[PDB]
């Protein structure tokens, strides 16, 4: 593509995370990188996300893939209107397909339930971070 700006001084590209919380900036920057975005979606009102967090910061697999792409952490309302209008139940996990839409293409063999928030999707949230990412670079 064009160039877009040089890099000096420090902070190459700046493209891992997203360091800042704010949901159109990271979606925009992840479609300026063209690179996918995977929106962690935390709540408030039922068991503190927190607990979820601990075991979330403790899983490496879950960090590796998410350091390579972007993880939008946002904890606000339970059914926000822009992902749950009509109120399904709480996420845990999301993802932006590069058209810039959402891909509920997931299935899956009943393990302990396939959707859920609480530590147990933990091993889910794992091959479902695979399944609702598919690809990586495009080429692999």
């Known amino acids: 593509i064009d160039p877009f700006t040089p890099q ?9 995370l ?18 996918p975005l995977m929106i962690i979606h ?15 910061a403790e899983n490496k697999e879950i960090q590796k893939l998410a350091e390579q792409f972007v993880l939008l952490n946002l904890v606000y309302e339970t059914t926000d209107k822009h992902l749950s209008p009509d109120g399904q139940y709480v996420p845990r996990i999301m993802f932006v397909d590069p058209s810039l839409t959402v891909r509920a293409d997931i299935t899956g063999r009943y393990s ?4 859920a928030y609480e530590p147990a999707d933990t091993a889910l949230l794992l091959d479902n ?5 598919k690809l990586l670079k495009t080429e692999l």
């Not at 704010?22 to 690179?35: C, F, G, P, R, V």
């Not at 935390?42 to 979330?56: G, I, N, T």
């Not at 302990?112 to 959707?115: E, F, G, I, V």
């Not at 971070?129 to 990412?133: E, G």
């Open 42 to 56: 935390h709540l408030d009102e039922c068991p503190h996300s927190q607990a979820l967090k601990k075991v979330f």
């Open 112 to 115: 302990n339930r396939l959707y």
């Open 8 to 16: 000096t001084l420090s902070r190459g590209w700046g493209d891992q």
């Open 129 to 133: 971070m695979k399944k609702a990412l």
């Open 18 to 35: 997203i360091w800042t919380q704010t949901y159109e900036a990271a979606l925009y920057k992840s479609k300026t990188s063209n690179k």
